[PDB]
Amino acid sequence: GRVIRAQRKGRANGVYKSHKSGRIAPAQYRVYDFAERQGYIRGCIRDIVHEPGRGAPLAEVAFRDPYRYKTNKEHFIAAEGQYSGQYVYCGLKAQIAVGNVLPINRIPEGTVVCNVEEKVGDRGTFSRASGCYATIIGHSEDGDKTRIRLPSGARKTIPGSCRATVGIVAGGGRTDKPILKAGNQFHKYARKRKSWPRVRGVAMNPVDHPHGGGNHQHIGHPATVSKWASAGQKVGLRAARRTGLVRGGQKEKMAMK
RNA sequence: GUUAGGACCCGAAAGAUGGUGAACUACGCUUGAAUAGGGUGAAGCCAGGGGAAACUCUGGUGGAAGCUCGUAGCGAUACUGACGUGCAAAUCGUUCGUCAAAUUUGAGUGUAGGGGCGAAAGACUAAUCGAACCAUCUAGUAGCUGGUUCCCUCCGAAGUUUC
RNA sequence: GAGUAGGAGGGCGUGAUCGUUGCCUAGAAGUAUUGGGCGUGAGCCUAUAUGGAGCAGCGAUUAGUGCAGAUCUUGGUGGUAGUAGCAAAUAUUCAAAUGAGAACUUUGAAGACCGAAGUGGAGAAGGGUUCCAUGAGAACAGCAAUUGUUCAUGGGUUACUCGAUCCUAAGACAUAGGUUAACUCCUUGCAAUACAAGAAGACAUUCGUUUUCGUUGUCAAAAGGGAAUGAGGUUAAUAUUCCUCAAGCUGGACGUGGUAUAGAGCGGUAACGCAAAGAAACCCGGAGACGUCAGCAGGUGUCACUGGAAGAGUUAUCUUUUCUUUUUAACAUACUAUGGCCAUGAAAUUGGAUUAUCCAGAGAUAUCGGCUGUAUGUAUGGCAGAGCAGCUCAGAGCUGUCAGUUGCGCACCUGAUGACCCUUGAAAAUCUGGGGGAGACAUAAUUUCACGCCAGUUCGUACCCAUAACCGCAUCAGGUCUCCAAGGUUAGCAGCCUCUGGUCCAUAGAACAAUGUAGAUAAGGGAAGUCGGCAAAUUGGAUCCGUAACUUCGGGAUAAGGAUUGGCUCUGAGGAUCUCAGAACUGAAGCGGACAAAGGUAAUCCGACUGUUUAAUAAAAACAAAGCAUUGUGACGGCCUCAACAGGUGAUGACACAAUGUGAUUUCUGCCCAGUGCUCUGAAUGUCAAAGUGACGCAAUUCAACCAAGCGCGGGUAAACGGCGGGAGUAACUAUGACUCUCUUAAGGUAGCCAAAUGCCUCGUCAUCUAAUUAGUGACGCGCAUGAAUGGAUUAAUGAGAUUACCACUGUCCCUAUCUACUAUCUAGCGAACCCACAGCUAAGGGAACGGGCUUAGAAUAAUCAGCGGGGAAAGAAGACCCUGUUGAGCUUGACUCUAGUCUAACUUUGUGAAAUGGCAGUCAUUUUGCUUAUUUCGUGAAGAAAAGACUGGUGCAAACCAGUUCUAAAGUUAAGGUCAUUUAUUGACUGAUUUUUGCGAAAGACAUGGUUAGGGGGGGAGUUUGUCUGGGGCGGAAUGCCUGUUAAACCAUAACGCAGGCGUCCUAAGUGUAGCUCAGUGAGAACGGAAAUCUCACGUAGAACAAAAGGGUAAAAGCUACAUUGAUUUUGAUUUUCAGUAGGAAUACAAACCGCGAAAGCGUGGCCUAUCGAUCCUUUAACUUUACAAGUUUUAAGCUAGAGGUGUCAGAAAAGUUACCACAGGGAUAACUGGCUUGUGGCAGCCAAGAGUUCAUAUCGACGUUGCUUUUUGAUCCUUCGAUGUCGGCUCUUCCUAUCAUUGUGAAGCAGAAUUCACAACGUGUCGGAUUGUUCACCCGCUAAUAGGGAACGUGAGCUGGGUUUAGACCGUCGUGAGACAGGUUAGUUUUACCCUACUGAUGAAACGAUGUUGCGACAGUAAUUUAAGUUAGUACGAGAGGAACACUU
Ligand SMILES: [Mg+2]
Ligand SMILES: [Mg+2]
Ligand SMILES: [Mg+2]
Ligand SMILES: [Mg+2]
Ligand SMILES: [Mg+2]
Ligand SMILES: [Mg+2]
Ligand SMILES: [Mg+2]
Ligand SMILES: [Mg+2]
Ligand SMILES: [Mg+2]
Ligand SMILES: [Mg+2]
Ligand SMILES: [Mg+2]
Ligand SMILES: [Mg+2]
Ligand SMILES: [Mg+2]
Ligand SMILES: [Mg+2]
Ligand SMILES: [Mg+2]
Ligand SMILES: [Mg+2]
Ligand SMILES: [Mg+2]
Ligand SMILES: [Mg+2]
Ligand SMILES: [Mg+2]
Ligand SMILES: [Mg+2]
Ligand SMILES: [Mg+2]
Ligand SMILES: [Mg+2]
Ligand SMILES: [Mg+2]
Ligand SMILES: [Mg+2]
Ligand SMILES: [Mg+2]
Ligand SMILES: [Mg+2]
Ligand SMILES: [Mg+2]
Ligand SMILES: [Mg+2]
Ligand SMILES: [Mg+2]
Ligand SMILES: [Mg+2]
Ligand SMILES: [Mg+2]
Ligand SMILES: [Mg+2]
Ligand SMILES: [Mg+2]
Ligand SMILES: [Mg+2]
Ligand SMILES: [Mg+2]
Ligand SMILES: [Mg+2]
Ligand SMILES: [Mg+2]
Ligand SMILES: [Mg+2]
Ligand SMILES: [Mg+2]
Ligand SMILES: [Mg+2]
Ligand SMILES: [Mg+2]
Ligand SMILES: [Mg+2]
Ligand SMILES: [Mg+2]
Ligand SMILES: [Mg+2]
Ligand SMILES: [Mg+2]
Ligand SMILES: [Mg+2]
Ligand SMILES: [Mg+2]
Ligand SMILES: [Mg+2]
Ligand SMILES: [Mg+2]
Ligand SMILES: [Mg+2]
Ligand SMILES: [Mg+2]
Ligand SMILES: [Mg+2]
Ligand SMILES: [Mg+2]
Ligand SMILES: [Mg+2]
Ligand SMILES: [Mg+2]
Ligand SMILES: [Mg+2]
Ligand SMILES: [Mg+2]
Ligand SMILES: [Mg+2]
Ligand SMILES: [Mg+2]
Ligand SMILES: [Mg+2]
Ligand SMILES: [Mg+2]
Ligand SMILES: [Mg+2]
Ligand SMILES: [Mg+2]
Ligand SMILES: [Mg+2]
Ligand SMILES: [Mg+2]
Ligand SMILES: [Mg+2]
Ligand SMILES: [Mg+2]
Ligand SMILES: [Mg+2]
Ligand SMILES: [Mg+2]
Ligand SMILES: [Mg+2]
Ligand SMILES: [Mg+2]
Ligand SMILES: [Mg+2]
Ligand SMILES: [Mg+2]
Ligand SMILES: [Mg+2]
Ligand SMILES: [Mg+2]
Ligand SMILES: [Mg+2]
Ligand SMILES: [Mg+2]
Ligand SMILES: [Mg+2]
Ligand SMILES: [Mg+2]
Ligand SMILES: [Mg+2]
Ligand SMILES: [Mg+2]
Ligand SMILES: [Mg+2]
Ligand SMILES: [Mg+2]
Ligand SMILES: [Mg+2]
Ligand SMILES: [Mg+2]
Ligand SMILES: [Mg+2]
Ligand SMILES: [Mg+2]
Ligand SMILES: [Mg+2]
Ligand SMILES: [Mg+2]
Ligand SMILES: [Mg+2]
Ligand SMILES: [Mg+2]
Ligand SMILES: [Mg+2]
Ligand SMILES: [Mg+2]
Ligand SMILES: [Mg+2]
Ligand SMILES: [Mg+2]
Ligand SMILES: [Mg+2]
Ligand SMILES: [Mg+2]
Ligand SMILES: [Mg+2]
Ligand SMILES: [Mg+2]
Ligand SMILES: [Mg+2]
Ligand SMILES: [Mg+2]
Ligand SMILES: [Mg+2]
């Protein structure tokens, strides 16, 4: 009657607790200054650094505070091509250039974007991953709706007034180089909550996991588990609509269209 | 003499309640320490021959890798060696795996019992683990094993019936 | 006159209580008795001795009242036994001294060890006084002790600069807020799930006053950050602390000098410079502040060498010799230092530059150029006065401590670089700098200059840090984190040897047997040893040669293989202002001379690789992994956590996170969606709850209708679980095999691939390898049971992974020998433990079927010592196997019951406008559309919300729009300016910077969310169950409830998983009655007519029929036919069978009825008789002046009697698996081994004689039959062993059997010789070497006189071995949904104890008829030699020939 690893990941005292010591700051947008809603504020890239858990570089941006003498530092998401010492413009009137931040409604159809906002003033939500971009599909005439195409490829309607970064998230392509050694995988996952290495549920004894069968090593019970499966029940491919790999009758994706 | 109770006395593998442990050991984390001398020879760089250049061949230079021989360290293959009322409740001799990483290691700090923690052996969790340890309910129940303490005299069995 | 289990009657002995009678310092109780007595016996009385204060009898009362046991409790003691033993870590020895005593103490003299990876010098953790001195009886320091880590007594731990204290980290905890019955719990640095929380200044100097800026805590580092100290000297024990001398730091407070200014240093073109050169808010910096690795450069320390001086060692010989000292702290001043800058000038015939990179018109190179940064550098101060080394004097004194050189040497540090990351390598306190210039100030004000004055608190500072101060019950061969490191050899921090420093501590002496532990070496052969090359052996460095297949082109690779290596004397080449190569000579042809240091090759299987794993039996083929693939999720979300409020991932956002699977590359990925699952924006009414609705009722209720999810229906889905046959036919000897048809609700083994680590048969078949191969490899494949990410086929590198050859190699073997050390031995000293009913010689016998004890025989002499492994069915542990238990636990599910998260519906939280519609007399039901204030979500240093307006500019008709901040890693703050007063000052007031507004901002909005109910779902989780009998259990079967005939033996009764069978129904007639008839069958006879249809007669004891099995019963019937009728009915009770003489099932006889049939008697309470069946509680029904308990009427609800609904395990529980991860109580009531009975089966013998032997039964055999024997087969049984008799085989060794293989002497023959066969006396002696296999067996290759068969607990595990078998890891196949399982393969997997008694082998040995020698006798015990060959016989006898002997003699 043991507790699977599946379950042990929701414990906050637990072993799976993110390794946060390296985190520089949250990467978000500027605060929603009056300046940004009605005008433009400009800042500098003091630097673009590497946060230890992030694929995408972070940009360190100096802004002058509208209301005081203080100089405000903030950390944005690197838009590919942004240079250290660049001028970055955020707001209503800010024009279209790589790394500037406008409302989506002001961004032309077909344009590529970063760090979009789900609700206005998110300081960012969508397409933050290294190399990711969101695609601008359409605007309503009113100006209040915008159709975005997310990396996953699902289309989404967002209030047009939302903040977006012109361009693509930096450091793209990393996902493409094969990792040859296991050690690499190790160091990588060292800076995030530990997912590694992964022991197959069949290796284990019936006590450690629904799968581990026994004398043979098989699942022996259907591995498509229903969405309502209880905590320790939910193990295989959950709520899966299809299972196999589609080879051969691929013309079906087309003919079905 | 029936029966209830500690119920002639001693005896479980178990249950439940409420506590205590991560000084061993398992996995994080912060912050320190540590690993002779060799072999090999990648990019990158120089020159010589050929070429108009691209590039080619020969010779250097350079110093890569979860590469290699091999100490210390970390480990544990074999003799099925020694010892087996030990030096020792896991040691000793030879031998052996690995030896700049998924390496070794100190402290501090996160995880506690149907819970942790696990490169998964039902492994580890203070000589305790296919459910720790401490006390209590608890003299737990025992159709089962063992014991059941002075004398003489007299009567004297059953192992079949039924449920 | 017996007696276990058991019961009764009397009695003995012990406390204490109420009585009664007494005894005791003139000696109570208790205790010892080879004193004297009493009881059959419990027990008693006395005597003597001891003892030194209480006792005793009798009658009752009461009881913690009697012990040999319980592996019983606690305590005390034996034998073993002066035994096992005190043997790791190389070592000690001599003299003196001290002491009662010295192998073990102290000095000296010798010999060795650790050998700067220490047995050295110091720390952290841990210890806590173990430190120092003096003293010392016992104990302890496993011998000893004069000695101590021990005992006693005293004494030791000084700090501004070391550390703690401060800072921040991983973290953590308050406060606030919220949750809990409560305890508890949730949040908080990016600080909050919080928030009216703060700090500073000045005057005041309290308050107060006043001003300024402001959201809010703390703890966690004796290795991280971190203000400043050094050298010398001193104590018995402390010292970067005390003393002496010399320094630095921070905080104070003034003094004296000096900088700067009427606003605030001076020099240089410039980098920049110089003791000093005004300041607040405010904002920004620098240092602190950082990874790993590789090479280069420099410095420190060390090491080496050179001249000088002092000392010491050597001096027969040689040595201008060999060793030693020859030092310089922090700190002060000045200079130099791997880089970077500034000029001037610009570079192409491009240059510069590093070992490496790399730089330049984005200005390189270069200038008698210049500036700047870092010392663990130089000089001087310190400083020689100290320290060190010498030499004098009797505490004082003198001399010298000097001047050079080099290093790929070594350790550390620094400097400039380079390489690396799907890694990118803290923070804060602290010190300091910049931008800004609001304030302050004339007798003034302010200022990082000198020199002087004052202070630095609290705690830790001893000592060990380990083969004796820690943890391992210890002075334990284990374990436990760091720093410093010398010479020689050398690649080397290796090994070996040394110097500094340390140490000889491990009880000792002597002998030198067996056996052992460790170390070596073996002629000839070379794995023949063995499950196996286990173990050992070989190989090994460096230089030169030479180097295959295979391959992922990296590799393979020291592949394989072949040579060389010393010494000495010369020669040449590489460099600054230590490497490399040649030649010659010389030796026992040796020379990596010690040390160090791979054995190869060819195949097969796994896993791709580095990595991981079962602390203490598994290191692997298991896990991991990179790659492949699949699922889920766009945040109103996924996965998980959570008692609650709530939370984590998330400082996140698809190149992301959460679930699985497969397992590098290469190649391939067949066909099945019927099932189980999962899924869907499909259809729809089949099914379905609470609430709400409708109808009946003064009502409770009941009845109806509607109704979410889920179910069912339909679609999708196999890199989801999983599946990939059975039958028939066709071609037709079958099989396998081809096609076809067919059946199950899918499909019907596609590519591939094997007797595979997955084929039973199996030692498959053929090749190959060998002399011989159940082994290896390659092939074939009627694949028991191969097959595609439940992955299939491949595969280089690779491995303490499985297997087979071969080469080298060898003590594995033939075959065993010898040598060393430590033991065993003996001695001084010291000194346990296991175990122990009582004990210990056997033979048989019987016996609980292997006695030590008993019967009968053999027989039997003290006490000892070293050995041993036969016996004590020896020790170990209340069997881990097996069964039993109404005993468990781990795990599983399609077991029973339930259960958290979850899905769905209702009511509620719940507001308000409007519209549309229906009903009601403004309200209500329904639909639609709003609003926002409840509610929810997310933000924000709750600034620019919503609505209006304005300056400038531009576009511009108003309107509206655009701009007043887009080349440029800068600056933008205590403000200007206008208007109006005071006051003449950044004074006062407005404006500069519009207005209004009882929403900080945004997103949802009565939705969601929360609360309670209702229906789904739920091995994630809880609880529990998972019959019995049984020739062990299981699988099977029911001898589980019933009936008949047999076993059963003439009343009844009687066992077995004993025989042969039958029951859980069937029947409105097959019950009941009346009447009539006589059936089965046989002979003879009648159109179609036939063996058989109907019709006749005669005869028919019953041979037919009677639902069902059997047995019995029946002839004007019980049978056949016809008709009538419900007695298959109403009351009770009794009787018989089984029997507890309970129930239940059956049936019988009565008494009351009400009937049917018959004229009537009569017969009917079911079937001719013997089987056909079912309690308590509950429900339902029938019949009844039973009750609802103040009184009533209802409705409803309870009752009494009796049926039906049922328990088949049938006297009647609601109940699935797995465990090899396992557990407990027991069981020899019961399996697995030996032994016992049996002997079918196995084996071995006979009797008869049909036959075979050409002729002839019995030379040699023996059919059909038949009598036996044996216990090396197997079976059967269950007697002994379940608080354990160690369960296969081989090795080793001994003995016995004879059913004789050989050898000896013979008989017989279908015996010529030779060979062979049968038989007798007979084991006396012998019965071998290898292939394959764990093997017993089997089969082959061989030699041989022969290669006999057996026994001894299937001889022989405190004798080995451990291959097989049978725990725990893991692979395949088959089975199961699963956990798991195989009576199927694979692979890894512990083998303990002897010192006792006996036994045997050896060895001493007391004592009688006096002692003691020498020489003998010999009882008895044991015995030992067995074969073969050659010559000769002899080419002989015999024989047609082929062929072919023997005795004697000799070796
Ligand atoms: Mg916590
Ligand atoms: Mg990839
Ligand atoms: Mg499970
Ligand atoms: Mg298994
Ligand atoms: Mg598998
Ligand atoms: Mg599998
Ligand atoms: Mg009584
Ligand atoms: Mg009683
Ligand atoms: Mg208990
Ligand atoms: Mg508890
Ligand atoms: Mg710890
Ligand atoms: Mg070691
Ligand atoms: Mg050995
Ligand atoms: Mg070892
Ligand atoms: Mg019983
Ligand atoms: Mg008493
Ligand atoms: Mg007296
Ligand atoms: Mg008396
Ligand atoms: Mg006396
Ligand atoms: Mg009495
Ligand atoms: Mg007693
Ligand atoms: Mg006793
Ligand atoms: Mg004793
Ligand atoms: Mg010993
Ligand atoms: Mg020592
Ligand atoms: Mg030491
Ligand atoms: Mg010391
Ligand atoms: Mg913190
Ligand atoms: Mg916290
Ligand atoms: Mg300091
Ligand atoms: Mg001082
Ligand atoms: Mg001062
Ligand atoms: Mg660096
Ligand atoms: Mg000299
Ligand atoms: Mg310079
Ligand atoms: Mg002097
Ligand atoms: Mg150097
Ligand atoms: Mg070091
Ligand atoms: Mg960096
Ligand atoms: Mg300034
Ligand atoms: Mg020790
Ligand atoms: Mg000795
Ligand atoms: Mg030899
Ligand atoms: Mg040979
Ligand atoms: Mg030889
Ligand atoms: Mg070996
Ligand atoms: Mg090569
Ligand atoms: Mg070679
Ligand atoms: Mg090879
Ligand atoms: Mg030579
Ligand atoms: Mg030469
Ligand atoms: Mg020579
Ligand atoms: Mg040699
Ligand atoms: Mg080999
Ligand atoms: Mg491997
Ligand atoms: Mg691990
Ligand atoms: Mg381990
Ligand atoms: Mg996906
Ligand atoms: Mg899969
Ligand atoms: Mg497939
Ligand atoms: Mg309803
Ligand atoms: Mg077909
Ligand atoms: Mg084979
Ligand atoms: Mg062989
Ligand atoms: Mg073969
Ligand atoms: Mg290998
Ligand atoms: Mg002697
Ligand atoms: Mg002795
Ligand atoms: Mg007998
Ligand atoms: Mg006997
Ligand atoms: Mg006798
Ligand atoms: Mg014995
Ligand atoms: Mg014994
Ligand atoms: Mg169970
Ligand atoms: Mg429910
Ligand atoms: Mg369960
Ligand atoms: Mg029967
Ligand atoms: Mg009977
Ligand atoms: Mg039957
Ligand atoms: Mg009649
Ligand atoms: Mg009966
Ligand atoms: Mg009658
Ligand atoms: Mg009934
Ligand atoms: Mg027979
Ligand atoms: Mg016969
Ligand atoms: Mg038996
Ligand atoms: Mg035993
Ligand atoms: Mg025995
Ligand atoms: Mg005979
Ligand atoms: Mg015969
Ligand atoms: Mg052999
Ligand atoms: Mg045996
Ligand atoms: Mg096993
Ligand atoms: Mg299966
Ligand atoms: Mg098996
Ligand atoms: Mg003993
Ligand atoms: Mg003897
Ligand atoms: Mg005489
Ligand atoms: Mg004599
Ligand atoms: Mg004599
Ligand atoms: Mg004799
Ligand atoms: Mg002869």
From Swiss-Prot:
GO biological process: cytoplasmic translation
Domain of life the protein comes from: Eukaryota
GO molecular function: rRNA binding; structural constituent of ribosome
Compartment(s): Cytoplasm
Identification of the protein by name: Large ribosomal subunit protein uL2
Similarity comment text for this entry: Belongs to the universal ribosomal protein uL2 family.
Claim: Cytoplasm is one of the keywords in the record: yes
Family matches, as Pfam families: Ribosomal_L2 (PF00181), Ribosomal_L2_C (PF03947)
Family annotation (SUPFAM superfamilies): Nucleic acid-binding proteins, Translation proteins SH3-like domain
Keywords, alphabetical: Cytoplasm, Ribonucleoprotein, Ribosomal protein, RNA-binding, rRNA-binding
Species for this entry: Tetrahymena thermophila (strain SB210)
Primary localisation category: cytoplasm
InterPro entries listed in its UniProt record: NA-bd_OB-fold, Rib_uL2_dom2, Ribosomal_uL2, Ribosomal_uL2_arc_euk, Ribosomal_uL2_C, Ribosomal_uL2_CS, Ribosomal_uL2_dom3, Ribosomal_uL2_RNA-bd_dom
Record's GO cellular component terms: cytosolic large ribosomal subunit
